[PDB]
Amino acid sequence: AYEWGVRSTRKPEPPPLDRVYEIPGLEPITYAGKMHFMPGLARPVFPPWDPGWTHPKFRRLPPLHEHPLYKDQACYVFHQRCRLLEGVKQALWLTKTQLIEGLPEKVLRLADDPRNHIENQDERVLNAISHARLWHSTEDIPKRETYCPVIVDSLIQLCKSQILKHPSLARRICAQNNTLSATWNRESILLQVHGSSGARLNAKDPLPPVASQEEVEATKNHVLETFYPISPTMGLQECNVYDVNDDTGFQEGYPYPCPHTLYFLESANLRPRRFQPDQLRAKMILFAFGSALAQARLLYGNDSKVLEQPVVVQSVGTDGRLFQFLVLQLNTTDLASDEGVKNLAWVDSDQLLYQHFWCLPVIKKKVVVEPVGPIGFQPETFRKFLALYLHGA
């Protein structure tokens, strides 16, 4: 056991007590009388100091066990920034879910409809890319923290323009930074996703379940993958004080009660600061799961049952250059057992919007080889994006 302190650092131990405290019955005479240090006087010891009235700021931090909400049951918290080791695998085991490659076919047929495209699609999306990636900033080369939310919001604005053709879209309201508390029991281990995602799109009307019953029953047979050496819990935050209550960012009787789409941005500049595209997928699976379980226990309640009316949520997530689409159908409120019928997750991953961008003309041998702009454009990714936006109408 090589210890991790360095004696040279560790706060200096008390000077060994002056020997006049070694003599029974004797009164050590100390400089406590002069209220300042003196040599030649023995050194005093002092009562632990008690300012009988407690000042709120300067006081010694309340020891943690003292709290009312404190519980002795270890609880694993997951929040906005938690990093999971095996992203989708772990995500699923925590969630008791199975993943399917493509998006649901309904949303597909939405996307590919000749009718649902904008006026000039490529014009608009290329212009949104160029704006967010270049035109929105004063400086030549903007950073990720600005342009990522700019691109996501610009997409959202191109889709908001569809409300004229499809005026069922007035049913939706956006919400930023929403306290979300979802507590459940999974296989003797207590898991709670607690915190704020970036952006929530709420719908006035719930979402129609996208899985045929065949999918459900076939999901009942699926064997969950196990990663042995790794506890499923790894990448979470242990805690001894938490609240078990089912909360979504809103009180009773909210006019836009049903969570529709969640938006997860990666805005950071450092590579290691962001999420790896896998861990992102995980994070948004668990969170989508949360948004689902919230309503599930709102409209039905804490009882552990399988759902007769399947919940469905969506999530999009972003580098600003690269997207992850996800749709989550909650099928079960009893996850303690491992052997029941499982929720379903569709994930369209790593959908590249553009390849790479150039803000300055790239020049070789006194010629301009490459102009400024995006290289490559996938109308596919946007197609799916709009699609996920349009799913309620």
Partner: protein, 240 residues
Amino acid sequence: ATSVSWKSRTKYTVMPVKMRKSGGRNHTGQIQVHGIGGGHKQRYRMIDFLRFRPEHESKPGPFEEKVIAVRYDPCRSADIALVAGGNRKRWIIATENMKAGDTVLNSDHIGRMAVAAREGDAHPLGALPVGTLINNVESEPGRGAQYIRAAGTCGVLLRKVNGTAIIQLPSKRQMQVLETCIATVGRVSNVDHNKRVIGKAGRNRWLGKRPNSGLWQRKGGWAGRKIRPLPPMKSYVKLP
């Protein structure tokens, strides 16, 4: 005057931690050791040299862990592996062919019948066979391993006497230990570290190494080729 060492942190972490390098100075500001300074900026990874380290003191038994990744480290010759299991991640020193997506065993258990060693296997010496290749070797049981960490180097178990192992260090000096102590079986990563060639003075400076002096000296008596019979064997066995 006074300086503090950067080496202060209590918690084990996998995350790379920034550190202040000191060319050759002691805590006074004097120069202890010439030649050091101006390296490239380096982070330090916390390396667990105690390979068998039960995660919770509740369940004592033999471990298994997984290799997640293998990375270059600036601090040592050796390549390091990021290994996790249960709820903990830890860096340990990587044996030659350990690759990502892998399984590595730790055990303190001594069976009569010995065992068959994979590379990454950490074991009590006395439970290994008598010709094996070992590295990251501990002095006294529980201490953490000190000997045989460098790149491409490996030691060898010689014989087993009296409930005690005898091994051979890379200096070809032999070492006498209790059999109870843990060692990893194999050779350390990056075995061609020997044959790397510094191309230019620069690379040497990049390593943090400043030139030798320019003061010309005469070679003293001490110079020559010395031929010594081997030094006697180190025994960490304390007699009753």
